[PDB]
Symmetry: C5
Subunit: 103 residues, 5 copies
């Protein structure tokens, strides 16, 4: 298994690391049909989503998607610094695959 | 694909944005049958609900409804500023579709 | 839908509003068989339960009963002021139907 | 229903009340197979478990066992004073049936 | 049942205790397919994983794996001192079986 988010990210196509080293500026979530998603931004203007669960996702990802939205919410509310995001870059906004928090 | 709550809200019929830029004044939740819901207010008098799950809701919204009530409760307890709500305005109280939190 | 806990409470038989405007003094929870419940008290001694799930509850209430116990626990730990409880008064301790929190 | 943890405890065989009036000293949790459990200690050395789910448990206890482990973790992290534990004393460590928290 | 993490750890093949007595330095989690995992590090450079659920796990471990990730996140965010980890040291990074927190 990978030892860090960068090596994990590199195991997948259509991904990249964004380095933030900053707390989340805004947290948005929706229960509207077909847009059951979260959106976060940073004060540098960067915007990211947790995608709506879809047919691209495998069964094991369903709980992890829910966990990620839990993580983003509590990160936002505690002003935790986000180090990096691994995202898929074939979606707009870029879609979160992984998060690291440090410092 | 929307990048913010206003753009997401605009995808639906019978919605509008309310801008609060304030913490939640009160949080109410009920387990009574057929009224399994939450109600929030703001000091300006505005009142909003998370609707009881109904047949209007598609299957994917049910999990998101539960998440929204989790979000409103922890927002209330942490005195987090709510930036905007996207609501359906064909319900009273207006029914929450999405929330953004920012300072 | 109800605008507030008082109007909600009025929709049900065997209920009353208790106005506390105080934090929870004690929180008790049990996993013992046939007593899977929570009990709260306020400083003055007034005691309330979240009932064990039973035949009187409809299925939609089950997730809400779990949510209420989550709410009481976090309210207790954060010393959140409880405004009102809507309770069924045909049970001892009186059984919580809804809670409102306001500072 | 019982008004308090002491009266609840007395409804069961093989139980006793421990009166701690103290925060949890240590919190341990395990995902190892057949030891999916939590263990807590107090400064006085007293040690308690939340048992692995087993044949002695009834269905209604399953969610309550999971809730108890949630409660112990957050109690530990917030340094919440535990008033009493109701435990089964036919197990070692004594097995938690109920917890009360009060200032 | 075991009374502490060291005795619990010793019930299993291919494990060891690490004594950290330190807060978690970084927390990483992933929803990427087949890497639905968490990774933590400590300032001394030690790295640990919560393994992706797989065929080596029995059903009862699944909820406990999810719990462990919840615990590591909140331990990280609260800067809780981790006393010990029980890990399987036949994986890289070492895979967490249990955690103790004290002091
Ligand atoms: N990637 C796809 C994105 C594109 N979008 C565009 C918007 N589309 C909206 C479809 C989701 N459906 C509804 O929203 C909806 C809500 C409805 O009631 C509202 O339901 C609301 C709750 O959902 C609320 O109760 C309100 O008061 C009722 O009037 C009713 C119906 N309906 O009768 O079909 C549908 C989906 C496809
Ligand atoms: N869609 C429109 C929404 C509007 N709603 C508003 C409220 N109305 C609620 C009806 C749900 N039913 C009950 O609540 C209920 C509770 C009951 O027991 C109480 O159950 C209580 C727990 O629910 C408690 O245990 C108490 O002690 C028992 O006596 C009994 C019965 N009953 O015998 O019919 C009903 C329906 C319409
Ligand atoms: N609706 C009215 C409510 C009133 N209640 C009050 C309490 N009464 C409780 C009955 C539930 N049963 C048990 O508890 C129980 C636990 C048991 O094992 C303990 O199981 C315990 C865990 O549950 C623990 O592991 C312990 O070490 C074992 O010996 C065994 C048995 N049994 O062999 O019958 C029963 C029923 C009536
Ligand atoms: N009531 C007493 C409880 C204690 N006792 C412990 C030992 N078991 C033995 C039967 C299990 N057989 C295994 O072979 C086994 C291998 C395991 O290692 C692997 O699975 C692990 C995850 O579970 C790791 O992935 C590890 O790397 C991998 O090698 C883990 C476990 N387990 O239960 O967590 C079991 C009997 C019960
Ligand atoms: N085992 C260690 C990792 C190795 N890894 C790479 C090789 N795959 C092979 C089979 C998976 N095939 C995919 O094609 C695939 C596409 C993905 O991208 C899409 O799904 C993503 C969400 O999962 C995004 O929506 C994205 O936009 C969309 O393009 C994502 C994943 N995934 O697992 O998260 C898999 C197995 C896994």
């Amino acid at each position: 298994t990978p030892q860090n988010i960068t090596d994990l990210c590199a195991e997948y196509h259509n991904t990249q690391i964004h380095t933030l080293n900053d707390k989340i500026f805004s947290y948005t979530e929706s229960l509207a049909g077909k847009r059951e998603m979260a959106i976060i931004t940073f004060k540098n203007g960067a915007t990211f989503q947790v995608e709506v669960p879809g047919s691209q996702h495998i069964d094991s990802q369903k709980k992890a998607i829910e966990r990620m939205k839990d993580t983003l919410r509590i990160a936002y509310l505690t002003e935790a610094k986000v180090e990096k995001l691994c995202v898929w870059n074939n979606k707009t906004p870029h879609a979160i695959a992984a998060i690291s928090m440090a410092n």
